[model samples]
Target: RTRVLILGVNGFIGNHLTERLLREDHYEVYGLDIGSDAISRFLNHPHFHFVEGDISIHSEWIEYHVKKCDVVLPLVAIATPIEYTRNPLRVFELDFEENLRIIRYCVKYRKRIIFPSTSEVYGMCSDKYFDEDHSNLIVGPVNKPRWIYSVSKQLLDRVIWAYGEKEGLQFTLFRPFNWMGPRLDNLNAARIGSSRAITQLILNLVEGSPIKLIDGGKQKRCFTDIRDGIEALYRIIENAGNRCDGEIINIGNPENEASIEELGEMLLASFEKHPLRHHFPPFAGFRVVESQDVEHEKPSIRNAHRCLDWEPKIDMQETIDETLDFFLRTVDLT
Candidate 1:
């Protein structure tokens, strides 16, 4: 039986991806992450095994556990820009050098790996759409604070590519765009261009709070449904050797970009509200937290259609509807 391992299985993407992999019923799945809460959920499943530790610092735990898997997916990088900015040095260390150690381990073990890179690598493209071949540009100034996350993720991408090509490792690289779904650490959420606007509008609609638009929510991004994103990836993996070997492809809905005001209107139109569960307390003495300015944008997935032979099936409305459902129900107080 082939073994499949998922590092960073506690993450937003990792949670979805872990479930999808288990559902596929193809490979034996084991999760490697430090978050005990994540591991606790799957302890009942027989095929599911969890290691409570970091991959960067290998103990006998990693060596013993890693030897169990044939394929590895690392979703461990710090994702939210806000989270990265809060601890830039730690972000660089964990996301960059620390992950390199794991990749090196994969190389040593001859394990196939799927590593994710963000679209933030493309920075500000004057063009309408950014494809994979664009130049690397951090979204913010070096002196300013916002560049840490994008820079770390981008640098990680470059390192992965360089090592994968040079070492002849069987691996694939993905540059995922804006994604919306359950499992977003409500504390640390996506706040870029369109998705930020879209999420904000959804929140106000659900919570019956006032909507305040910054930049009048005019920025744009190619939003992706986490469902379609994972499915497309599995399709690519099924025939990895045949197509997408050592290839970096963009995987997202190409037509998913919409301005913030447009997104707000869409949510308003989608006011098919469920019965209010209960009378919620009014937010008193709450400070309005506006999203930061996003200079980082990219269309890095030009090769998605041709290379992966896939594109996002879910439209903006579909993604929004699903996300809105989760935001209202699953997230208690966002």
Candidate 2:
């Protein structure tokens, strides 16, 4: 059995990955996070070990675990765009500087590491099918602070690739194209884009707040279900035949493409389907807000297919239903 160390293990990816690993009963999981409230069920699992701690403040524990574990996954990130715009420097400090330390630790300890590089890294690309190996990562101007997250994650991806090329580091880079599901985000996140598009929309409806469409929200995205995305990740982690070694894989359901506006409408419709819909307040209609962001993103899963023998099995409607239902059951909107 392999020992896996997850730096931020209570996140959507971390929790789901942990759940999957425990079910397989082939991996022993060690996790560090500031909060473990979300993953209470996994606390006593014989194969699971967890500690409540911050990544930035827990350097000593992280360094020790790098040498202890067979595989390392650092999922700590400031992922949302609104946070990126508000505090670009903070994004750099944690997303770049703090994470760079762990990567270096992995490099020094000779541990196999899997890093979460976001689809945001492919900022402002002209290619419709954003390929893992082929697409140019065109980021934004300095004036627009939102690009900080993209730049930070892109740099780390490059650094990991360089480490692999120069020192034979065992690594796999996965770019998740808007993976969404239960525990995707905190429904109480104060700002829009702070949670995620779908959850934020649900938050708006629950609070009777109008949903704001950034730049008419015509910008499209390919949303993937977490299960489909995580299974692809499991394949990457399995790394059978060393096929995933030093590879960049884009895991997404490109078939689920929809404009942001269309997605918001879908969320509204899904919310209506809830049996308790009448108990929640009616949302104030849409409002447009000026913003600069990636207009459209569609990932090419060719690398995922060829390397991992994987493709997304879930579609957009089912994905939406599952997420909304999860939030409805777990999140207290009233």
Candidate 3:
């Protein structure tokens, strides 16, 4: 059996990926996270091993697992903007410093590393599309904390490339463009940082809060279904380090692009069409209000198609329906 080690196994992507990996008997998976019930169902699986620890700090146990694995996925990072701004140093520690350690270990052990980078690395792109090797990143001023997350992740991407050049580290870096779906962070919890626009809008509707759009929601983004995103990731993993190694690919659906305001309207329409709409009064009458503004983010996934033979198949309406359905079935709004 091929051995796999996943850092941040309790995170949104990690949890979903863990579930998918355990379904197949060919892979024995070891996961490390700071302890969450997300993996409770898989804990007793014979092929799955869950280690609860903070990746922000060095751990010999983590190294031990990394050494024993053939593939290492370090998905640990502060992915939410709020969390990144609130805890800049922690973001650096996890996204940069800790990942640097993991990359070093992978380099030393010749482990095939799959790192999930953010499309935010492109900052505000003025180009028609973001090609991995041909995009310019226009970042915010250094005084602003918002850019810290992107800067940190961007720095790490360069670091990985540096290692790949100097030490011949075998790795695949992927930038996710607004991948959102079920099991997203709870809006009422501190983990709201991980919750994206769609989840937040759904939660607001369910909880009777007014949905606020930043500066009329003109900033456009392409939201890919989490399952589709996972499929793209699985393709990279199965490539046997072929054309995927040392390549930075974007995982997203360009066809599903929508402005922030449009997304909110779509959610409201979906809820109205949903059978569960009668259960929640908030969904009856709500409007999208304007707030602050941000950048427009969309990606060119031509590489993901050409390299890994992968492309997102889900549409926006289907994606929203599936996400809202999961929240309704799993969460207790009252």
Let me know the TM-score candidate 2 reaches against the reference structure: 0.95
Q: 252-332, model 1: which lDDT tens digit per residue?
A: 776877755566666555545434434332322122345536533546465766766676788888887777666667655
Model 1 misplacement above 4 A: 36-41, 56-60, 134-141, 189-212, 268-272, 277-302, 332-334
Q: Output the better candidate (1/2) by lDDT.
A: 2
Whichever of 2 and 3 has more TM-score, that candidate is 2
> What's the lDDT for all of these models?
0.65, 0.83, 0.78
RMSD of 2: 2.3
| Ranking according to TM-score, highest score first | 2, 3, 1
Better of 1 and 3 by TM-score: 3
lDDT of 2 by residue, 205-293 (tens): 87899988988889998898998988998989898888898889988899999988999999998888898788788769899988457
Provide TM-scores for the models.
Answer: 0.82, 0.95, 0.92
